[PDB]
Amino acid sequence: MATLAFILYKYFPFGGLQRDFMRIALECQRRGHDIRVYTLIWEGDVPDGFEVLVAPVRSIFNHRRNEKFTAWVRADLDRRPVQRVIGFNKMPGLDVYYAADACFEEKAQTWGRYRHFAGYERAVFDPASKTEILMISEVQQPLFVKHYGTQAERFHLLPPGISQDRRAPANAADVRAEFRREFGLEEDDLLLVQIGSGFKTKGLDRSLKALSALPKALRRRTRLIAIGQDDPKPFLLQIAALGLNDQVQILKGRSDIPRFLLGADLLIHPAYNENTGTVLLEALVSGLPVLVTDVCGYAHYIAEADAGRVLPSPFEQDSLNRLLAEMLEDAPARAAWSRNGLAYADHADLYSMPQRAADLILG
Ligand SMILES: O=c1ccn([C@@H]2O[C@H](COP(=O)(O)OP(=O)(O)O[C@H]3O[C@H](CO)[C@H](O)[C@H](O)[C@H]3O)[C@@H](O)[C@H]2O)c(=O)[nH]1
């Protein structure tokens, strides 16, 4: 058979892991392979030719639900074999694992849950495992080796896989204008965007503080839009307390991210932690200056392209506050950062991930 089985716990269109999966699966499909997907949930369109299997397993604890998932999948595969098994979450029985997550053991070293997630990571990374690993954050490889001793030859570093529709188009100025008209933004207004479905760990709380803390002249001109498949309710108290009710909107998952990237004035991403941060590069290729914490795996790109500022660790609210103020005050610097991002996008390989992953998956 030429069937490839792709395994991920959750498909939905507004996540990095999920979009990377989709691009790899579509590339492998174009190369003559039918696609089977095993998942706990599939939200949104199913592409032609994808055989999507949603597990009927249930458990009160997610970690136990995941083990039941593995048994369910392995029983299906035993009955209906495939050419290769590619997982986007850590579990036993993968031929290939795409490391969309950072090293768990490292995070834990900051009971049933811990043992499950450590055991599933070990199932991939143990030296007796045969799983081949597609890395997307370079910084994580030494940590997997530290914790499991994984052989060097099993790791394959991929370049970024930013989709084409995020690159600034020929009519960028028209898209910007139409966006700003729609949202009621005038030339003297400043729009911050915080993009990604995980507002807490991506530091929406720090973004709101920095917005609140701006000097009066900037604070009056500036608004924030957060975009993600995430609950806004927990931030509403903070927004009211900071007096920002009229300056902040939180939207659900959107498929028109490129319009926000062209229409905004800064991307703010002061994440607590972030394996890579695709949105960081999407801002860069859009010419949108970025303010990001150094812990993000893709932060180095912002620094090296000089397409915004990276805030060094340890995190201090006061430094974020000050950096945001300094970036919004300096319109020449923002114009340079924008130019720098666009020029870097024309030279650097930020696009080829799905082809490279497919080459490794299929030999
Ligand atoms: O409303 C939304 C919100 C997000 N996105 C898209 O979803 C992706 C988000 O990817 P990020 O890496 O920025 O963030 P995630 O947290 O969703 O992604 C996860 O997987 C990534 C790639 O596999 C990285 O490893 C990352 O650190 C990890 O948290 C981007 O293409 C972004 O444009 C949308 O299309 N619509």
Residue numbers in the entry: 0 to 109, 118 to 370
Original authors' sentences:
In order to gain insights into substrate binding in PaWaaG we solved structures of the enzyme in complex with the nucleotide sugars UDP-glucose, UDP-galactose, and UDP-GalNAc in space group P21 to resolutions of 1.95, 2.02, and 2.20 Å, respectively. For the PaWaaG-UDP-galactose structure both monomers have unambiguous density for UDP-galactose. In PaWaaG-UDP-glucose there are three hydrogen bond interactions (Glu281, Thr283, and Asn282) which position glucose, whereas there are two additional hydrogen bond interactions (Asp19 and the backbone nitrogen of Ala99) which orient galactose and GalNAc in the PaWaaG-UDP-galactose and PaWaaG-UDP-GalNAc structures, as well as the side-chain nitrogen atom of Asn282 which is in hydrogen bonding distance (3.1 Å) to O4′ of Gal and GalNAc. Interestingly, structural comparisons show that, while the galactose portion of PaWaaG-UDP-galactose superimposes perfectly with the galactose component of GalNAc from PaWaaG-UDP-GalNAc, it occupies a quite different position to the glucose moiety of PaWaaG-UDP-glucose. In contrast to the glucose sugar comparisons, superposition of PaWaaG-UDP-galactose and PaWaaG-UDP-GalNAc with EcWaaG-UDP-2F-glucose revealed that the twisted conformation observed for glucose in PaWaaG-UDP-glucose relative to the EcWaaG structure is not present. Instead, galactose and GalNAc adopt the same overall position and orientation as 2F-glucose. The hydrogen bond networks for galactose and GalNAc are also very similar to 2F-glucose in EcWaaG. Interestingly, PaWaaG was also unable to hydrolyze UDP-galactose, despite the crystal structure showing that the sugar binds in a very similar way to GalNAc. This may be due to galactose potentially being quite mobile, as evidenced by the significant Fo-Fc peak around the anomeric carbon of the sugar, which is not observed in our PaWaaG-UDP-GalNAc structure.
